[PDB]
Design a protein around this ligand. Structure first.
Ligand SMILES: CC(C)(COP(=O)(O)OP(=O)(O)OC[C@H]1O[C@@H](n2cnc3c(N)ncnc32)[C@H](O)[C@@H]1OP(=O)(O)O)[C@@H](O)C(=O)NCCC(=O)NCCS
Ligand SMILES: Nc1ncnc2c1ncn2[C@@H]1O[C@H](COP(=O)(O)O)[C@@H](O)[C@H]1O
Ligand SMILES: Nc1ncnc2c1ncn2[C@@H]1O[C@H](COP(=O)(O)O)[C@@H](O)[C@H]1O
Ligand SMILES: [K+]
Ligand SMILES: [K+]
Ligand SMILES: [K+]
Ligand SMILES: [Zn+2]
Ligand SMILES: [Zn+2]
Lengths: 433, 424
């Protein structure tokens, strides 16, 4: 409380009364901006949403939800509200070519707001400009790459844009550049600790002090295991491309719930069936509204993420609400190696091969603390192909899947009728979650 | 002609010389704080009074890749890295060299990339796609920050996944693309495979670099995609992209002399070459503060093109990179550069764009893919193959073995194309 340091004290410890008037002011502004987009112009016209519709924060429930299906239907720029040709500076797109992906368009204001939120998060968990920050997240279209890169530079850290994989090079950068802060997915942080002891280095005797872990569900125990293996303090990091990427919700040094930055987001916990707000503190679907986005704001977006608001004041002194861990989702999406994948993306690739049967199964397992994706697909007795030709097709399946879902899966061609029958195709998740 | 920074881009030679001298003295005073240049200046008697003219830089010895490897990782860091260091980049076997940047250094680098892009006609209204690898590769974050500084709608596609690259161009209406010359050809091929005419896209401008390539190789890219392609020079040591770049005249790459001091030195004597002769490119940073580099031997061979450019810019122009010193190969005691082979192969329209030089025990094998548009028979193609052997023999002064291979048979590299395979 008294010894707690803040990036933006006036906002981070702002009274609930002053937070409510800030959210209402930014909510009205967001709706007036969003009304310029072809999608929300249509939505507001059909539901009688005008400039007088929002007088309180509860009036947001007059506006219907924004679903992923709606966003896919308006791909690529149906929800763009600003002047993209003049002020649009970046596009963040989701994976795929078999279906319409998700596109978020940002202006310079939007990138600066996002970079400030990431800097706020990093400063909160004790990271300073004197720290050496290494980002093991994939770059390019992945928001974790450029997101933490801009945020850590804004804070003033000596950044190490290592990007994904090559654990020996990751260990080399930590040892030679004296890395103190590291961003990694929980399973990769365990892999790095393992690679340290393979190279004859004690994973507890490095320059590492702080770890930022996210992109996928993990228990408090899995985080405590990471903390013991590397002799560090690990903090839960929440984000999604739709909400910028990282910097949305983050743990404080109390490591009890993730503080949601309510100055930039309006949080709603809704019953996934009725679509009504859940009783205070119960598990429901996370529904979010951007409050500082201008190029492409999102109003009441159904994230399909399940969580709850943790009650009571936090001893760090911050007034921004805390959410519990995200354990699962209300949709059919699965996360492997921190990458979001829909089972339809896999099916749309497999159906193109006439040598394959219709029956397929996706299995998610943990092998040596690392997550693996196994795609079993039955053979069609219609093919006249021998071993050499079928193996070439199996390698072509791996390659086309890798390009679509942005992860390399294990593909096994199984006997016709070997896989069990159910009748939508299920994803068998055998991981400890 | 439109300029990003007119006052600097058309600045008189007299005013450029006093700007370079002012920034050279500042660079040497900053570099003196690094453990490496503190020792170098102490042993060679380099003080604050040693530099009074631009010619006085020759009092300071050269900085080689070996000196940088010997002082890896932060032996040449001059600034306060803990307080002002904001990024570490690395260059593409052994111990990769590291460059440390402050916020000033990143902003200077971003401004140079924006200056380059604006010069070739790219504006904030353009949709810029970067197919360069991100992470530690300077091409990724280098063009990303530069294009955002200009105000382009950026598409950080990163390396590979050609089907997704084509999808982004088609759906986001990409007008400007950054790619290595060999990957630009691969994308044009993938467009045709997906039933799209590579000449009927929204693409208008292409930025190509990293790989040594001929003018005809670039003209092939321009015809395949119906675009204007511009040569982009850079290296991690000098920030990455934005160092040297062609103007709309497409005749020599303008070197930004406000941020770099250019020298063309004889690799044997270590003295400046006669005005306009081919020699080793030796560079000094003039706007870098965290880790400046003084008279760095790049290993790149080029020459300064004489005369003022019709675009009105007063900044000197360098010719195409002949190749790096490590690219040179010796067969039967004769020195050969891979660009000598490419400059011959590009003149034959019956040949493709992908080729491979193999050295075995000594024999030199030159594999080159056939064109898809080729309708020639065996007798005519064999006559062309014999014409290729003759023209190669006269140029490289050794008789090589030439094999005409199937289109797509030769392997495509993940990054820069490997043109020489030495199996000796
Ligand atoms: O991703 P992918 O394309 O499926 O490839 P794979 O996951 O098979 O593994 C390749 C590398 O990526 C690494 N990796 C996987 N997911 C990662 C993530 N989200 N972040 C960082 N590295 C990751 C693996 O550890 C492996 O490197 P290592 O062998 O050096 O330990
Ligand atoms: N800290 C976290 N804990 C659990 N799941 C997370 C976390 N951060 C992100 N996710 C999940 O990843 C999704 C965002 O993925 P993406 O759009 O690729 O950044 C979220 O909607 C969550 O389902
Ligand atoms: N436009 C270009 N033409 C030819 N070679 C280039 C070009 N740009 C860069 N290079 C080469 O690539 C090197 C820089 O590589 P890197 O620092 O790994 O990006 C230079 O020193 C040159 O040898
Ligand atoms: K720093
Ligand atoms: K994720
Ligand atoms: K723009
Ligand atoms: Zn707290
Ligand atoms: Zn010019």
């Amino acid at each position: 409380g008294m010894s707690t340091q803040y990036w933006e004290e006036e906002i981070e410890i702002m009274s609930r009364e002053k937070l409510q008037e800030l959210q209402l002011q930014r909510l009205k502004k967001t709706i007036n901006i969003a009304a310029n987009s072809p999608y929300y112009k249509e939505v507001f016209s059909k539901n009688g949403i005008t400039g007088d519709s929002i007088q309180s924060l509860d009036d947001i429930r007059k506006i219907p939800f924004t679903t992923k299906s709606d966003m896919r239907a308006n791909y690529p720029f149906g929800l763009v509200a600003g002047d993209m040709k003049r002020d649009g500076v970046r596009i963040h797109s989701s994976s795929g070519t078999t279906g319409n992906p998700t596109v978020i368009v940002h202006s310079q204001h939007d990138l600066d707001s996002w970079a400030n939120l990431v800097a706020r998060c990093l400063y909160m968990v004790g990271i300073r400009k004197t720290d050496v920050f290494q980002n093991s997240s994939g770059y390019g279209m992945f928001t974790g790459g450029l997101g933490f890169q801009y945020g850590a530079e804004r804070l003033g850290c000596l950044t190490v844009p290592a990007a994904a994989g090559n654990s020996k090079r990751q260990i080399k950068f930590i040892s030679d550049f004296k890395t103190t802060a590291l961003h990694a997915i929980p399973s990769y942080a365990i892999r790095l600790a393992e690679v340290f002891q393979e190279e004859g280095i004690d994973p507890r005797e490095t320059t590492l002090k702080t770890l930022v872990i996210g992109a996928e569900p993990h228990t408090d125990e899995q985080r405590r295991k990471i903390e013991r293996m590397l002799n560090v303090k690990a903090y839960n990091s929440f984000g999604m491309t739709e909400m910028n990427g990282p910097g949305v919700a983050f743990e404080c040094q109390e490591q009890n719930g993730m503080h949601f930055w309510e100055d930039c987001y309006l949080v709603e916990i809704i019953d996934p069936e009725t679509g009504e707000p859940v009783p205070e503190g119960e598990i429901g679907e996370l529904v979010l509204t951007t409050l500082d986005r201008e190029m492409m704001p999102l109003i009441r977006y159904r994230t399909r993420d399940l969580t709850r608001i943790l009650p009571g004041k936090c001893p760090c002194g911050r007034t921004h609400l805390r959410i519990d861990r995200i354990k699962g989702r209300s949709d059919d999406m699965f996360i492997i190696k921190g990458v979001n994948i829909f089972p339809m993306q896999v099916e749309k690739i497999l159906v193109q091969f006439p040598e394959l049967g219709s029956n397929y199964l996706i299995t998610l397992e943990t092998v040596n603390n690392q997550d693996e994706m196994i795609v079993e697909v039955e053979l069609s007795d219609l093919s006249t192909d021998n071993y050499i030709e079928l193996e070439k097709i199996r390698r072509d399946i791996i390659r086309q899947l890798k390009d679509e879902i942005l992860v390399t899966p294990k593909v096994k061609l199984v006997k016709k009728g070997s896989l069990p029958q159910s009748e939508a195709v299920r994803v068998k998740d055998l991981r400890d979650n």
